[PDB]
Amino acid sequence: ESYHKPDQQKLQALKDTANRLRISSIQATTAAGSGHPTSCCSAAEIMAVLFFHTMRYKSQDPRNPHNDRFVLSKGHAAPILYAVWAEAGFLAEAELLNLRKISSDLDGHPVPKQAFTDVATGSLGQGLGAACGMAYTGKYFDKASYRVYCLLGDGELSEGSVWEAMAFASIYKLDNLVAILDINRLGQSDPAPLQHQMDIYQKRCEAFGWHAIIVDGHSVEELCKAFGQAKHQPTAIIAKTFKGRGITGVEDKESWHGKPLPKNMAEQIIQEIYSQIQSKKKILATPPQEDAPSVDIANIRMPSLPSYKVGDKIATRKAYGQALAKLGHASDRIIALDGDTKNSTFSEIFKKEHPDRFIECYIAEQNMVSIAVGCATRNRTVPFCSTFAAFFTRAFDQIRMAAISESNINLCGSHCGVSIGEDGPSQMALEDLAMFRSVPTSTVFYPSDGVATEKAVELAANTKGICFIRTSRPENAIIYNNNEDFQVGQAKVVLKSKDDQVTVIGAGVTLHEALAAAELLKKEKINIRVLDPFTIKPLDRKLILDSARATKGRILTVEDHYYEGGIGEAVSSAVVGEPGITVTHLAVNRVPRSGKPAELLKMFGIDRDAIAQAVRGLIT
Amino acid sequence: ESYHKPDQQKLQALKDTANRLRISSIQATTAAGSGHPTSCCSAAEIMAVLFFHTMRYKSQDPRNPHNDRFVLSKGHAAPILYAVWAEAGFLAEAELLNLRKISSDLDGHPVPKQAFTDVATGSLGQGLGAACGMAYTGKYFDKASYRVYCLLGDGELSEGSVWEAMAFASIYKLDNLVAILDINRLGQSDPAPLQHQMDIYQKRCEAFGWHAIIVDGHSVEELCKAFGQAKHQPTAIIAKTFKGRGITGVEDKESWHGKPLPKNMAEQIIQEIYSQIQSKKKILATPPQEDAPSVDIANIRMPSLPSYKVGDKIATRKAYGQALAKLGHASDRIIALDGDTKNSTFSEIFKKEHPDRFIECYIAEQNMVSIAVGCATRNRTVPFCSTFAAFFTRAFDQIRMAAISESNINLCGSHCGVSIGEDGPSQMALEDLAMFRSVPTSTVFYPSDGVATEKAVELAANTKGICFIRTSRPENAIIYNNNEDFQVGQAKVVLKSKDDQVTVIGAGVTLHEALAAAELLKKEKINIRVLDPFTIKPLDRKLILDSARATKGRILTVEDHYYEGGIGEAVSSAVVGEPGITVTHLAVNRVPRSGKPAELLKMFGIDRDAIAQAVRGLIT
Ligand SMILES: CC1=C(CCOP(=O)(O)OP(=O)(O)O)S/C(=C(/O)CO)N1Cc1cnc(C)nc1N
Ligand SMILES: CC1=C(CCOP(=O)(O)OP(=O)(O)O)S/C(=C(/O)CO)N1Cc1cnc(C)nc1N
Ligand SMILES: O=C[C@H](O)CO
Ligand SMILES: O=C[C@H](O)CO
Ligand SMILES: [Ca+2]
Ligand SMILES: [Ca+2]
């Protein structure tokens, strides 16, 4: 636990290691013909000191739950990440030369198919948020001794998501977290705004609550000392470096970002760098203290059935909070995150019952998603984050990268559609189905009553990938019995007869408007089938087609969402070309406006009267 | 012009005005049954001083180009915005009571159907970026004397987009910009992280380069004085306020965000506030100096036809930069913005030729979009912002709000799809068609060669709404004659014969793969029709169906995009139910990986061999 103050031999070995890391970064990117060697070279001493002096980890078990965590937020320096894991003996040295090949897993940016990578990076400014999740988990959930280190670029610090993470770490006193800023003066296409004004970086980090240390980022001794001292708050090591450090004629120059060295130049430069290496002997990693606890990864089952009764009124946003609090008694791994909307999403119910597992993320949706991704790494927790569904559009790049990170997180977005009424369109989610359907690992739950909501929470907890649950503001009636069985990809026919003339597909508020339309139409001797998809992705194609073939081939979809990328388009894409099938589509055709929920459902053509009129037009 | 130091009577009139604004905010939200009176009341002295001492504007012409700008970033305080414009005499006082009604345009959050609103707010943290665009336009494009004032909440300051804007304003020395921070201690569901630690707010603003003044936010005199001194930096007025100020029993209390007062309570409170008002006499607005220049509104035309030659190879990303620079020579209204990717998007070509109209936005996509929106307000410029298409997912909420703002901005996203090759999925746009198609005011151009790209740039410049141009990395052949006419919503058949067996729809790289598949299939005596959509939204439904009817009803769509929300789903939704029509869909089915462009097109089943295989299977 004491700092091991290095002797001159250890320091020289760390210098030798940094220069081996430079050589490998050049060799690999020259072999591939693409990549970012100058972005690797500015970080070589940082990487050497982190992996061969400061960090504690099992070199043959990178995912080990007791290990210190390292997050390469500037993911385009991937070649030097691969180099340190070869230096540590986990990766074969020859495999480094296969960088970016389709036959290799040493891809252009780090990805979790690599045992030594927890989260994919490559979209800049997201790594510190994931690191914050890891550090929060280590400090407050695992209560373990591992530390979390996150390496960022200086151009990267222009992303606002970075400063959300900065503020989060000081709010939650993440003294097990270290951010290393590679201040190499240059971005991709020009100098970074602050260049080498190290004092301004220090002032910005200190103002956001971090202990900020300016170092020479090419001095292994200064780095050892800065990493070695006792942290009392999150610590920023602000490293003055030169891009392309060690590449004569390229160091500190523009026009070299993302440019590999040609073969002839690489050979010449590598010879120069090799001439600076005093010994070929490698430093061994040091293993960690093994005090992370065991976690139960068994299937998660609710402690009881839903306790609703058919006919009761409840909004699915309220049923979400009730179900999430219940799920917290079913599993110690459930955590909840919310962005200052807990009284609107009803995640406050979970907070009241399991306060130690609720994370207030404040008005910072991008960081909230990144925190959840970090908390889910190494399967330590099962996160549920919530806000208005409209404000998950603020975090789309984090959600996109979460799928590239093969992350298992759960997202519940409330206040979907025009049915929220008077707040108007800034608060109305009308594109969230399009957004989440386009996320490749996603399961999109759209529960239509309190029972389906509780069942969706339970299923989501046990489902891999990006799970989205779309909840609603109107109080609608319970239509399912408490022992109704639900499955991902299985729809429900909630009204049927042998004389059905259309299959009407609705969800949430428009399922209840479709049931109301069915009652109106029965007064004119017109029966319609009503189908509740339950999951919009994956869609129950078979039940939709079987239903349509029983209703003259006619499908009518109605949704509180824009036309593009929603339920209607999913249904059309599923059935196109099937003989005799037709699909009519009712949705929201433009930016809405303020009014009462029923007034807006009418104005935008997705209420019971619009459904009934569409049905009549189909019959004639 | 000299500061007019107000006498005690002017100060009392400002207090009277602030209290009238309180009363109206309460009356309107109690009448509506919803809204945020406590969020209005903390800002009442700020609003009174801004509109009736500091700002200069035409009270009867809120959109006038010489006016100072006000941006209500904390948009849920809309009732007090409406109240000031009634106090200034633009809005009928009686209409305030119709807040949030479907019969009114005084909607729950501000929207540009209101003459006094430039940008919609309601999604927190976006107003300051729009204000930065307005102030940049005022200082460097209009070169006018108007100033820009932006009111933010304190919970709102947790959004990273705010700090991107803070940094932008100090980089570009926006000394015509003032941010007012309503530090009323409380957010929606808890105190804001910093509560009333005014010194930490000051340190954060100063560290980001702003002149920061702490004031008593309920002192009209301190506010007059703080607003009355211009600076050489953007200026942050950090106002210590109490939420619900002036509402006895509610001031400084939790559990009141977004809660209207019940009628009995509102009547009692209003009588208390009215007893503090010394005179009914209203202050008059003071008009501005009229030095904003005229701006032309005419159609913008390229100075000449494209000058490519059929058979030449150019990537559409390079054609974009060439076309944008060319268009810059025809109209001085064109401005370009980029997020440190100008050497990759080729917006660097525009920077080289028109440096005064290029805005480097650094690695901050959310702010870049907001800057563009701000620059486009009052039609002052025609902005084109660019980055990798994948990183526009970082700005989806800003793009969403831009459509609610009825903004005319142009966005070009490069590096779409797996065809970028070795960088891997973090850089691959595979959901951008889904995202932009879901934006209700959007036109989505997907040019397949350099000619189409230049035509798309010209069309986009003259098209209202959110225009997206998807560009690509591969260097594909010019296929169109320079004099080919292009229109929004009109596709092109680029290969046909009388014996065509399938209509293959591709775009960008998959159009060229389709053309290569056609050559492979001709060896097998199989002709295919090949169709280039040009715009994905709106889709040329008629040409698609006419083509399909000439090819035995068979359509095959192939796209470098995920399955959901892209070209295939757009086509399927357009043609579903049409007799005899079938649609086969080839797209990317999961998160990709690194490899050569051609290897990834093959791996993910969208190359010439996958297309030919699908055609051979259809014909059987
Ligand atoms: C602009 C940019 C880079 C420059 C980073 O400069 P830096 O100072 O943070 O790091 P180094 O100087 O250490 O290189 S790396 C890069 C890529 O596309 C490659 O991922 N991009 C485009 C990019 C833009 N926006 C986002 C969100 N992610 C990105 N990866
Ligand atoms: C959390 C939140 C508000 C609290 C604002 O606190 P503040 O301190 O900035 O302002 P005041 O204290 O001055 O009210 S107003 C609000 C709404 O949905 C209403 O638009 N929301 C949800 C919200 C969440 N995220 C975003 C991006 N926008 C939002 N509007
Ligand atoms: O009351 C409902 C509001 O929409 C959020 O609490
Ligand atoms: O060509 C290399 C990168 O893709 C951008 O220029
Ligand atoms: Ca840099
Ligand atoms: Ca506040």
Neighbours of B250 (CB within 10 A): 20
> Beta partners for B237?
B180, B213
- Cβ(B255)–Cβ(B191) under 8 Å? no
| Residue tagged 């807990």 (tokens) | A342
Answer whether A596's CB lies under 8 Å from A420's CB: no
Between CA B74 and CA B47 the distance in angstroms is 13
Tokens coding B458: 């010209």
- Selection from A406, A401, A405, A429 nearest residue A345 by Cα: A429
* Structure-token match 């069985």, residue found: A485
Whether the Cβ atoms of residue A444 and residue A437 lie closer than 8 Å to each other:
yes
3-state secondary structure of A214: strand
Distance from CA of A569 to the nearest CA of B (A): 6
Distance, CA of A252 to CA of B184 (rounded, Å) = 46
Q: Do the domains spanning A1-294 and A295-488 agree at the CATH topology level?
A: yes
Burial B540-562 (b: 16+ CB within 10 A, else e): bbebbbebbebbebbbbbbbbbb
Residues of chain A found within 8 Å of residue B129, distances taken between Cβ atoms: none
Q: State how far the Cα of B292 lies from the Cα of B296, in Å rounded to an integer.
A: 13
A497's CB contacts (< 8 A; 6+ apart) are: A527, A529
List all residues 6 or more positions away from A161 whose beta carbon is below 8 Å from its beta carbon.
Answer: A125, A126, A128, A129, A366, A367, A370, A398, B160
Query: Considering only CA atoms, which residue is closest to atom 5 of ligand 3?
Result: A344
- CB contact B426 to A (< 8 Å): yes
Q: Which residues contact B1 (CB under 8 A, 6 or more apart)?
A: none
Q: Are strands B69-72 and B148-153 parallel, antiparallel or unpaired?
A: parallel
Give the DSSP letter of residue B555.
E
Query: For strand A442-445 and strand A466-470, is the pairing parallel, antiparallel, or unpaired?
Result: parallel
- What whole-number distance in Å separates Cα of residue A510 and Cα of residue A525? 22
Distance CA A439, CA A467 (A): 10
CA of A133 to the centre of ligand 6 (A): 26
DSSP-derived secondary structure for B132-172: HHHHHIIIIIS--S--EEEEEESGGGGSHHHHHHHHHHHHT
Residue A238 near residue A183, CB atoms below 8 Å: yes
Token couple for B435? 């995202």
Distance in angstroms (rounded) separating the CA atoms of residues A470 and A567: 13
Q: Give me the DSSP letters along A273-285.
A: HHTT----PPPPP
User: Which amino acid belongs to residue B260?
Assistant: P
User: What six digits make up the tokens of A519?
Assistant: 């009652």
Alpha-carbon distances of B172 from A190, A205, B361, rounded to whole Å? 16, 21, 10
The partner residues of A388 in beta bridges, in order of sequence, read A414
Q: Length of chain B, please?
A: 620
How far apart CA B464 and CA B442 sit, in angstroms, is 9
On whether the CB atoms of residues B450 and B423 are closer than 8 A, the answer is: no
Annotation-wise, does A317 bind a ligand? yes
CB distance B35 to ligand 2 below 6 Å: no
B317 phi and psi angles, rounded to 5 deg: -65, -40
Q: Under an 8 A CB cutoff, do A594 and B441 touch? A: no
Q: How far apart are CA B212 and CA A207, in angstroms?
A: 13
Token pair 């959050």: residue: B109
- Beta-carbon count within 10 A of B393 CB: 27
Name the residue of B473, B594, B600 whose CB sits within 8 Å of the most ligand 4 atoms, as the mutation to test its pocket.
B473
Query: Known catalytic residue: A206?
Result: no
Q: Give the residue carrying structure tokens 């997180």.
A: A409
**Six-digit token string for A319:** 């049923």
Q: Cα(B67)–Cα(B82) distance, rounded to whole angstroms?
A: 18
> From the CA of A476, how many Å to the nearest CA of chain B?
20
Closest CA to A99 of A89, A86, A88, A90: A86
Q: Do B581 and A577 touch (CB under 8 A)?
A: yes
- What type of residue sits at position A219? S
Distance of CA A112 to the CA centre of its chain: 13
Whether B254 contacts chain A with CB within 8 A: no
Q: Can you tell me the distance from the alpha carbon of B240 to that of B396, in angstroms, rounded to the nearest whole number?
A: 33
Rounded to whole angstroms, the Cα distance separating A100 from A491 reads 42
Answer for the pair B170, B208: CB distance below 8 angstroms, yes or no: yes
Which stretch of DSSP H or E encloses residue B531? Answer: strand B527-532
- CA B332, distance to chain mean position in Å, is 22
A241, two tokens:
């470096």
| Cα A620 to Cα B121: distance, rounded to the nearest angstrom | 44
Give the other-Cβ count within 10 Å of A276's Cβ.
Answer: 12
Q: Say how many CA atoms lie within 13 Å of A345 toward its Cβ.
A: 32
**Range B275-282, long-range pairs (CB < 8 A, 24+ positions):** B276/B15, B276/B19, B277/B16, B277/B19, B277/B20, B278/B12, B278/B15, B278/B16, B279/B12, B279/B13, B279/B16, B281/B13, B282/B17, B282/B87, B282/B89
Token pair for B248 = 């006895």
| Residue A279 alpha carbon to ligand 2 centre in Å | 59
- Taking CA atoms, A39 is separated from A149, A152, A300, in Å, by 18, 11, 44
Residue A162, classed as helix, strand or coil, is helix
Residue entry with tokens 């991709």? A188
Please report, as a single letter, which amino acid is at residue A259.
K
Residue B445 Cα to ligand 2 midpoint, Å, equals 35
CATH of B295-488 among 3.40.50.970, 1.10.10.10, 3.30.2010.30, 3.40.720.10: 3.40.50.970
Q: Residue B224 and residue B226: Cα distance in Å, rounded?
A: 6
User: DSSP 3-state assignment of B413?
Assistant: strand
Q: How far is CA A213 from CA A49, A177, A233, A238, B204, in A?
A: 16, 14, 12, 6, 18
- H helix or E strand, kind and range, residue B84: helix B78-87
From B289, B192, B274, select the one nearest B241 (Cα to Cα).
B192
**Alpha-carbon gap, residue A201 to A192, rounded angstroms:** 12
Instruction: For residue B538, say if its preceding peptide bond is cis, omega within 30 degrees of 0.
Output: yes
The region that residue A240 occupies, defined by phi over 0 for left and psi between -120 and 50 for alpha, beta otherwise, is: beta
Q: Report the half-sphere exposure of B184 (CA within 13 A, side-chain side).
A: 34
Closest to A350 (Cα-Cα) out of A535, A360, A584, A364: A360
Q: Which residue(s) pair with B149 in the sheet? A: B70, B178
Question: Distance between CA atoms of B384 and B409, rounded to whole angstroms?
Answer: 7
Which residue has its alpha carbon closest to ligand 4 atom 2?
A: B344
Closest CA to B575 of B593, B551, B594: B551
Q: What are phi and psi of A72, to 5 degrees?
A: -90, 90
The tokens for A173 are: 């006193």
Is B108 an interface residue toward A (CB < 8 Å)? Answer: yes
Phi and psi based region of residue A125 (left: phi greater than 0; alpha: psi -120 to 50; beta: remaining): left
How many Å lie between the alpha carbon of A422 and the closest alpha carbon of chain B? Answer: 5
Q: Is the dihedral of CA B199, B202, B204, B209 positive or negative?
A: negative
Contacts of residue B4, Cβ cutoff 8 Å, sequence gap at least 6: B53
A538 preceded by a cis bond (ω within 30 of 0): yes
Report the gap between the CA of A366 and the closest CA in chain B (Å): 8
- From the list A188, A179, A161, the residue with the least C-alpha distance to A39 is A188
Find tokens 């009549």 and name the residue: A616
Amino acid at the residue B176:
N
SS3 A515: helix
Return the residue of A nearest to B576 by Cα: A576
Strands A148-153 and B313-315: unpaired
No. of helices (H) and no. of strands (E), chain A = 21, 19
Structure tokens at B1: 């012009």
CB-CB: which of A33, A156, A595 is closest to B102?
Answer: A595
Q: What technique solved it?
A: X-ray
Beta strands at B442-445 and B466-470: parallel, antiparallel or unpaired: parallel
Instruction: Output the six-digit token pair for B102.
Output: 């479907």
Question: Between B541-550 and B567-575, two packed helices, what is the crossing angle to 10 degrees?
Answer: 80
How many Cβ atoms are within 10 Å of B481's Cβ, its own excluded? 13
CB within 8 Å of A389: residues ≥ 6 apart: A413, A414, A415, A416, A429, A432, A470, A471
Catalytic residues of B: 365
Q: Is the dihedral of CA B91, B374, B144, B460 positive or negative?
A: negative
**Residue of B158, B360, B393 lying closest to A397 (CB–CB):** B393
DSSP A78-138: HHHHHHHHHHTTSS-GGGGGGTT-TT-S--SS--TTSTT-SS---STT-HHHHHHHHHHII
Angle (nearest 5°) at CA B213 between B208 and B217: 125
CA distance B145 to B131: 15
Which amino acids bring their CB within 6 angstroms of ligand 1?
Answer: A 39, 42, 74-76, 122-125, 153-156, 182, 184, 186-188, 192, 243, 257; B 339-341, 363, 387, 391, 394, 427
Q: What span, in angstroms and rounded, lies between the C-alpha atoms of B618 and B620?
A: 6
Residue ranges of alpha helices (H) inside A331-395 are 342-345, 348-353, 365-376
Q: B309: closest CA among B493, B534, B532, B481?
A: B481
Nearest by CB: B340 against A155, A163, A591: A155
Cα separation, B152 vs A201, in Å, equals: 25
Q: Please say whether the beta carbons of A84 and A55 come within 8 A.
A: no
Q: How far apart are CA A346 and CA A450, in angstroms?
A: 13
For residues A564 and B567, is the Cβ–Cβ distance under 8 A? no
Can you say how many angstroms the Cα of residue A562 is from the centroid of all Cα atoms in its chain? 24
CA-to-CA dists, residue A289 to A294, A377, B474, B619, angstroms? 14, 19, 50, 64
For chain A, the domains span: 1-294, 295-488, 489-620
E strands in A436-537: 442-445, 466-470, 476-477, 492-495, 500-505, 527-532, 535-537
| Secondary structure (3-state) at B367 | helix
Resolution, in Å, please? 1.5
Ligand 3 site residues (CB inside 6 A) read A 343-344, 473
d(CA B159, CA A56): 34
Question: Number of CB pairs < 8 Å for A and B?
Answer: 322
Number of other CB atoms surrounding residue B459 within 10 Å? 18
| C-alpha–C-alpha distance, residues A486 and A458, integer Å | 10
The dihedral over CA atoms of A195, A201, A204, A208, expressed in degrees to the nearest 10, equals: 130
State the sign of the Cα–Cα–Cα–Cα dihedral B72, B77, B78, B82: negative
**Which of A35, A75, A569 lies nearest to residue B569, judging by beta carbons?**
A569
Question: Which pair of tokens denotes residue B422?
Answer: 């070795």
Helix (H), strand (E) at residue B573: helix B567-575
Residues 6+ positions from B388 with CB-CB distance below 8 Å: B341, B344, B345, B413, B414, B415, B427, B429
Amino acid A614 reads A
CB atoms within 10 A of CB A74: 29
Q: Give the sheet arrangement for strand A211-216, strand by strand.
A: A69-72, A148-153, A177-183, A235-240, A211-216
Tell me the backbone φ, ψ of residue B236, rounded to 5 degrees.
-105, 115
- Rounded to whole angstroms, the Cα distance separating B408 from B484 reads 26
Q: What is the architecture of the domain spanning B1-294?
A: 3-Layer(aba) Sandwich (3.40)
Pick the closest to residue B289 from B149, B176, B146 (CA basis): B146
Closest CA to B453 of B353, B534, B348: B534
Listed residues: CB within 5 A of ion ligand 6? B 153-155, 184, 186
Report the SS3 class of residue A256.
coil
Atom of ligand 1 lying closest to residue A258 CA: 19
CATH 3.40.50.720 describes domain B489-620: no
Mind spelling out the 3-state secondary structure of B443-497? Answer: EEECCCCHHHHHHHHHHHHCCCCEEEEECCCCEEECCCCCCCCCCCCCCEEEECC
Q: Tokens representing B266? A: 């509102």
Could you write out the three-class secondary structure of B307-338?
CCCCCCEEEHHHHHHHHHHHHHCCCCCEEEEE
Residues in chain A: 620
Rounding to the nearest 10 degrees, give the CA dihedral for residues B444, B449, B452, B456.
40
Q: Does A592 touch chain B (CB under 8 A)?
A: no
